[PDB]
Design a protein around this ligand. Structure first.
Ligand SMILES: *[C@H](N)[C@@H]1CCCN1C(=O)[C@@H](N)Cc1ccc(-c2ccccc2)cc1
Ligand SMILES: *[C@H](N)[C@@H]1CCCN1C(=O)[C@H](N)Cc1ccc(-c2ccccc2)cc1
Ligand SMILES: CC(=O)N[C@@H]1[C@@H](O)[C@H](O)[C@@H](CO)O[C@H]1O
Ligand SMILES: CC(=O)N[C@@H]1[C@@H](O)[C@H](O)[C@@H](CO)O[C@H]1O
Ligand SMILES: CC(=O)N[C@@H]1[C@@H](O)[C@H](O)[C@@H](CO)O[C@H]1O
Ligand SMILES: CC(=O)N[C@@H]1[C@@H](O)[C@H](O)[C@@H](CO)O[C@H]1O
Ligand SMILES: CC(=O)N[C@@H]1[C@@H](O)[C@H](O)[C@@H](CO)O[C@H]1O
Ligand SMILES: CC(=O)N[C@@H]1[C@@H](O)[C@H](O)[C@@H](CO)O[C@H]1O
Ligand SMILES: CC(=O)N[C@@H]1[C@@H](O)[C@H](O)[C@@H](CO)O[C@H]1O
Ligand SMILES: CC(=O)N[C@@H]1[C@@H](O)[C@H](O)[C@@H](CO)O[C@H]1O
Ligand SMILES: CC(=O)N[C@@H]1[C@@H](O)[C@H](O)[C@@H](CO)O[C@H]1O
Ligand SMILES: CC(=O)N[C@@H]1[C@@H](O)[C@H](O)[C@@H](CO)O[C@H]1O
Ligand SMILES: CC(=O)N[C@@H]1[C@@H](O)[C@H](O)[C@@H](CO)O[C@H]1O
Ligand SMILES: CC(=O)N[C@@H]1[C@@H](O)[C@H](O)[C@@H](CO)O[C@H]1O
Ligand SMILES: CC(=O)N[C@@H]1[C@@H](O)[C@H](O)[C@@H](CO)O[C@H]1O
Lengths: 726, 728
């Protein structure tokens, strides 16, 4: 048989994972059914750290727990109420693991926006009603740390909309120091930030549609401001209002609009912060130390570091994070070479110049672990494949010595990895995503020897061997010297003679990679396996993990090359002899929906049909942080001219020659529905027919169970009909 | 080869229908635009003259979209900067032009952004509303008079209606009534302080970075309705520095007892004015004849003169209580009221006397009173040939009811069975307007000997053009159901061979007192579908439809979403029963109430229809405005009609769509039928796992009538229809 839409939708073929949480450097927690066993990394044996029963009766559905470092409590999260992409509120309850008695006194508020323990011990810090509260003991009263919170105005401890989504990629906005002595946080002011407003219809019972209003800054609009503070969580009394010490500047940032882009504690008395100018090609890092007697925090200018650019923005999406040495005196952090390839550089806190410890036409995806003799990192060097992933270790005393921890384990099924070390990189869990089926192994850092296999996904392999699964070809093509990768999901019993319809799956956003060695079971799977349709992807100009030459090829010019190279890919794929020139479609979501629109509106006759889901249409309608970063400001003095040059509706006319399907959630807080409405309006004015579909109350993810299922069913029909498939 | 009526012909309106819109400025003359310059006409002899010349307001710097002559012909109201709001309400700029001195007035100019403005029934006075306030200008060059100081956006309206009174009760933005004399200016005052607001986005032009949220005082079923007060001021006692005194006319005590509405205002004399009030439960209504009193300058309304109008079978009136037409002295008036047998006829009232006398009866209804003279009473009815879907002009002698005469029945039978009329100030002359079933014909006449003066337009140009195009024919007939006959019409293709099996599209509306079956001549989408796609387009008037008596119309009282839906599926059933229908290709479509019905029918799971299109429909009545919905469904409270309110939602029938192709369409800026309505339909469908086709229209309202939107939406439905009928 074959992999169908129902399989995809009904998740008939699930991939097993092995989610574990190190609680120490020798132990880790792992959910075994309705039990939270605790394993021993060495002998790998376990024991029920907590029985499913324990938390029995309690008229509330519990979703995800959180054991304190002390292991003396396990805050229980329930009543989860999804907000933005990371934010959400829930009710909480602590439970003493030794008194088996659920806390009752001072219990954490309801509608909590975020909680978290101290890195060690059982200190609890939480945000409520936009204010910070601190608990030294689960059963003892909380201490107000802030008194300025104000729903969607003043945010203390939690990011505002754009900061969570495009900056800290998190809701949380507070960082505990190593031993829980200091509690740091940022403060966001949205007062002058405009609000995007949309209707939310809700349950049929609702008589009047509701209006959601979110402080959301669009390109060139008034941005939110920020303040950083640090409060000593030991000087707090039942009387004094914990005095928070602020950390301002740098003056090079205060000269105007800027953002806080990173918080990284170096030591128990030293914290690092990176600042980014609205024009994101200049970043400043400050390393501040606690001044014993004085109580304030000082950031020696001798210790600040400038990370600027002249061919684009800074970082892959933001100035990378620092990974400090144990004594917080120096650090390492990915930065761009003089050659354009991001590599690990070594800094001395008060030494302006760093030394690249890695180099070459490949790049470091990130720094995973740091010990006194080794720096563990992931890169895409191996086989010279930007789309592959591996764990590497480099000797700090000799950069010439760099061993690849994963590369050879099973070169067959594992060319993409992820790592997870213990409390002191004594052991680490290797996580293979593919090209084969997920494989999780446990190793020892002192020898890197494989302790055992935690999960081989044999159960799946079994089932999958009875399904006409599709195949996957990951290779490249060349354009003007440089080579650009791409991947094709091929139908079962592929035949290079027979011509197949081709569906171009695209995202093509700045620093993206739709071509990798990861094993995925999705809609493309069904299309290929059941509709014998080739689903391809191509990472052209603007894509990441190949040096700035590629990734910055679209600086201040979104909707140019990424769009062009996209057309070229299909343009050549056809010239491959197994593609039906007359049956080539293109589809994408978000940025991918934009490029998909720009392309179907290019008029290259190359495509027959295309689908754009939750697409951007005019960069001025998208948030600042993300947009300006590639486009600058929509001012005539800056880039307003190109901003206006890249709109989807400017190419409405050219839609007459293609078959278009536009879809969009009405509650999209990210890429506003307004975008897609502005598009349809353009097609109506020009006289271009096309199909549409809006999804009531769904956001950017159009992920609700029924919503998700419906859109894939619809898009199917669209595609199968466009390709004349039974 | 011979062509057909294509989509492009209807969209690009290639075959145009000549009109002839007069504008009686007197009982002897009328204004007519020479499509470049308006001129004056003499009804008597037919000779004309260039009243206002195109080459006059040039270099104006702006364009005029509507002129407006004064009652004394001494001034001409110029209108520019027009900006549409709702169905009738709009705003614009104005200028006064002296026709007696050919000079645009430059003093005390009418404000910019004016909401409404009308002359005086006589002379040349002016009453305009700016910023929700009423102002008066005795002379154009002179300053105005602030009649009100309570005006305020979305809260207090003085002289203009708020969204619901505009669309549902009055069907006009205006809320001021001059006294036939001109000395009196009566006006209404609406209060929406607590009326919930319907909010929705308006994206505006691409350059709008952040979408704008439109907030509107709109009461949904059972919500907090607006309140209202009445006033009458003396435009003679104005001339001052002091504030205008505004007398108020309250009660009736039978109306103040609870929520209610002001539904009609008609002056009777210079010192008499009649007001008709409606209760929130629109089945009871009072008529208050109020007489002026010079003694106290106040207005009184002797309860001894009220006329109650209630209905135990439904609501009062077709859509609201009918208007009264008063006699000379104003002690008597004629009006439409359904008689004890259920039909609407003309009843004679003498105020002081009880009950009224019907001067008309029969198994047909009086559509409307057009003119009242001391001599006769002219009206429109569907008496002729017992065709409910026919319309003719009659005249009944007031001194002997047996002397009824049809003024339009025989004029041109085979060609005209549907007429509308337009009289002069005292109806010395009138223009009949034959809009069916043949080519639109326009005729002018004299009341005296009812002579046929002449022809103003007989579309002989279109007629010639339609002689090289395969036009479809129209079949108007009926069928019996439950021993009753219900009419239906079909747009049959060219050479309609009863042998073949044609695909049929059921065009529906079926709203309360609606009528989709008539003798009217039309050139629309159906024309194209039948002519080019050879599709049979039919409509059917079932229970709840109008112009056939209350037994039928009130059939759906307190039961919207029942019989009218049923009778629809049935009609279809009965059509494929005639043999020239392909059971495999039966579709259905409707706009507004038509979408609702089209949705409910596709949701009844009868499987009779393959596909269906629903344009901006209603999904559940609690979503519609009170005035309308309530008049049929009552109150949505457990204590009244809530249950059925919950039973008639399209949403609850989602699962049954699994067996159909549905095309859902709505303008995102609809203020009438909130987009929210289709937003819920689409959501319930998605939750039951039903695939369907949707299409939203950015910034379009209930009409989806822009030039680009109109063509786009129709092109689209034509694609869906054909697709559904498997035909090129
Ligand atoms: C489509 N997916 C759209 C196209 C415009 C950008 N899109 C988004 O949805 C971005 N907000 C996606 C995004 C969000 C966050 C990060 C990020 C990266 C690194 C650190 C923190 C956050 C990247 C991309
Ligand atoms: C669709 N066409 C929808 C159907 C629900 C009501 N809709 C409207 O557009 C209007 N609210 C209908 C309407 C009908 C008739 C009148 C009217 C008022 C006064 C006298 C006669 C008719 C007003 C509004
Ligand atoms: C807690 C448990 O499940 N881990 C056990 C550990 O306690 C024990 O000392 C060891 C003995 O061989 O094996 C492992
Ligand atoms: C003595 C005085 O300044 N009391 C303070 C006042 O500033 C404020 O009301 C604050 C917040 O409630 O707490 C209290
Ligand atoms: C104390 C708090 O941060 N209130 C601030 C302050 O009043 C100022 O208005 C700022 C920027 O607008 O934002 C808000
Ligand atoms: C933007 C405004 O609403 N916030 C004001 C801010 O302007 C001012 O700086 C502060 C006092 O310093 O008080 C607050
Ligand atoms: C407004 C702020 O700066 N002060 C807060 C306030 O709640 C109070 O004034 C103080 C002492 O009770 O505690 C702290
Ligand atoms: C010219 C036209 O518009 N109306 C004229 C009118 O002025 C005149 O009274 C009459 C005399 O023959 O003919 C008519
Ligand atoms: C001009 C006037 O009638 N304002 C009114 C009134 O004061 C009252 O407060 C309200 C209740 O709806 O209606 C408003
Ligand atoms: C909701 C409304 O605005 N309430 C007002 C009330 O405050 C006032 O005392 C009264 C006087 O007419 O009018 C009412
Ligand atoms: C005797 C006569 O001249 N009476 C009328 C009077 O009823 C009316 O109130 C007035 C208004 O301007 O016009 C005059
Ligand atoms: C001539 C005079 O000034 N007209 C007054 C106006 O000022 C006042 O605000 C209004 C409300 O009572 O009453 C009137
Ligand atoms: C021209 C006409 O006769 N004007 C009179 C006017 O004085 C006033 O009396 C009112 C009521 O009768 O209207 C009439
Ligand atoms: C006075 C009267 O005729 N009002 C009628 C009332 O009797 C009934 O309560 C209602 C609902 O059925 O319809 C209305
Ligand atoms: C108020 C209404 O909705 N219900 C009453 C109903 O009990 C009664 O039979 C009828 C009598 O006239 O009036 C209606």
């Amino acid at each position: 048989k074959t992999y169908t839409l129902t399989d995809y939708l009904k998740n008939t073929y699930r991939l097993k994972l092995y989610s574990l949480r190190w609680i120490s450097d020798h132990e880790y927690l792992y959910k075994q059914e309705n039990n939270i066993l605790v394993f021993n990394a060495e002998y790998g044996n376990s024991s029920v750290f907590l029985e499913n029963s324990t938390f029995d009766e309690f008229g509330h559905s519990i979703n995800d727990y959180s054991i304190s470092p002390d292991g003396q409590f396990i805050l229980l999260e329930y009543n989860y109420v999804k907000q933005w992409r990371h934010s959400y509120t829930a009710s909480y309850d602590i439970y003493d693991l030794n008194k088996r008695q659920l806390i009752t006194e001072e219990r954490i508020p309801n509608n909590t926006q975020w909680v978290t323990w101290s890195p060690v011990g059982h200190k609890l810090a939480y945000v409520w009603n936009n204010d910070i509260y601190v608990k030294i003991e689960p059963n003892l009263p909380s201490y107000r740390i802030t008194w300025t919170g104000k729903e969607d105005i003043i945010y203390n401890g939690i990011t505002d909309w754009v900061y969570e989504e495009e900056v800290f990629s998190a809701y949380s906005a507070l960082w505990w120091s190593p031993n829980g002595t200091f509690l740091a946080y940022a403060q966001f002011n949205d007062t002058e930030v405009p609000l995007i407003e949309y209707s939310f219809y809700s349950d049929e019972s609702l008589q009047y549609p509701k209006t959601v209003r979110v402080p959301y800054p669009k390109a060139g609009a008034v941005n939110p401001t920020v303040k950083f503070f640090v409060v000593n969580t030991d000087s707090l009394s039942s009387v004094t209002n914990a005095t928070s010490i602020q950390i301002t500047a740098p003056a090079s940032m205060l000269i105007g609009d800027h953002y806080l882009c990173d918080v990284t504690w170096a030591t128990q008395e030293r914290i690092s912060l990176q600042w980014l100018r609205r024009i994101q090609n200049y970043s400043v890092m400050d390393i501040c130390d606690y001044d014993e007697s004085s109580g304030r925090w000082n950031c020696l200018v001798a210790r600040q570091h400038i990370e600027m650019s002249t061919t684009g923005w800074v970082g892959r999406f933001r100035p990378s994070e620092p990974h400090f040495t144990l004594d917080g005196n120096s650090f390492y952090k990915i930065i761009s070479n003089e050659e354009g390839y991001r590599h690990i550089c070594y800094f001395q806190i008060d030494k302006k110049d760093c030394t690249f410890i890695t180099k070459g036409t490949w790049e470091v995806i990130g720094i995973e672990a740091l010990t006194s003799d080794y720096l563990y990192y992931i890169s895409n060097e191996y086989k010279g494949m930007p789309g592959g992933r591996n764990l590497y270790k480099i000797q700090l005393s000799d950069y010439t010595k760099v061993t690849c921890l994963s590369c050879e384990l099973n070169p067959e099924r594992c060319q993409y990895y992820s790592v997870s070390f213990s409390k002191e990189a004594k052991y680490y869990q290797l996580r293979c995503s593919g090209p084969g089926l997920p494989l999780y192994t446990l190793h020892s850092s002192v020898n890197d020897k494989g302790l055992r296999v935690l999960e081989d996904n044999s159960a799946l392999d079994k089932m999958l061997q009875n399904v006409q699964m599709p195949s996957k070809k990951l290779d490249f093509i060349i354009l003007n010297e440089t080579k650009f990768w791409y991947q094709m999901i091929l139908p079962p019993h592929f035949d290079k003679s027979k011509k197949y319809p081709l569906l171009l799956d695209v995202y093509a956003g700045p620093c993206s990679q739709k071509a990798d060695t990861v094993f995925r079971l999705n809609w493309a799977t069904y299309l290929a396996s059941t509709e014998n349709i080739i689903v391809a992807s191509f990472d052209g100009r603007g894509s990441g993990y190949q040096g700035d030459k590629i990734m910055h090829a679209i600086n201040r010019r979104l909707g140019t090359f990424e769009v062009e190279d996209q057309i070229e890919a299909a343009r050549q794929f056809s010239k491959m002899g197994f593609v039906d020139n007359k049956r080539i479609a293109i589809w994408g979501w978000s940025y991918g929906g934009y490029v998909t629109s720009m392309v179907l509106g290019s008029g290259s006759g190359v495509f027959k049909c295309g689908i754009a889901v939750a697409p951007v249409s005019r960069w001025e309608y998208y948030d600042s942080v993300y947009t300006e970063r590639y486009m600058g400001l929509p001012t005539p003095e800056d880039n307003l001219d190109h901003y206006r040059n890249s709109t989807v509706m400017s190419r409405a006319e050219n839609f007459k020659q293609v078959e278009y399907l536009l879809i969009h959630g009405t509650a999209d807080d990210n890429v506003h529905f307004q975008q897609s409405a502005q598009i349809s309006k353009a097609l109506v004015d020009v006289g271009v027919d096309f199909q549409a579909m809006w999804y009531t109350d769904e956001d950017h993810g159009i992920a609700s169970s029924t919503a998700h299922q419906h859109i894939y069913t619809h898009m199917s029909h669209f595609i199968k009909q466009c390709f004349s498939l039974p």
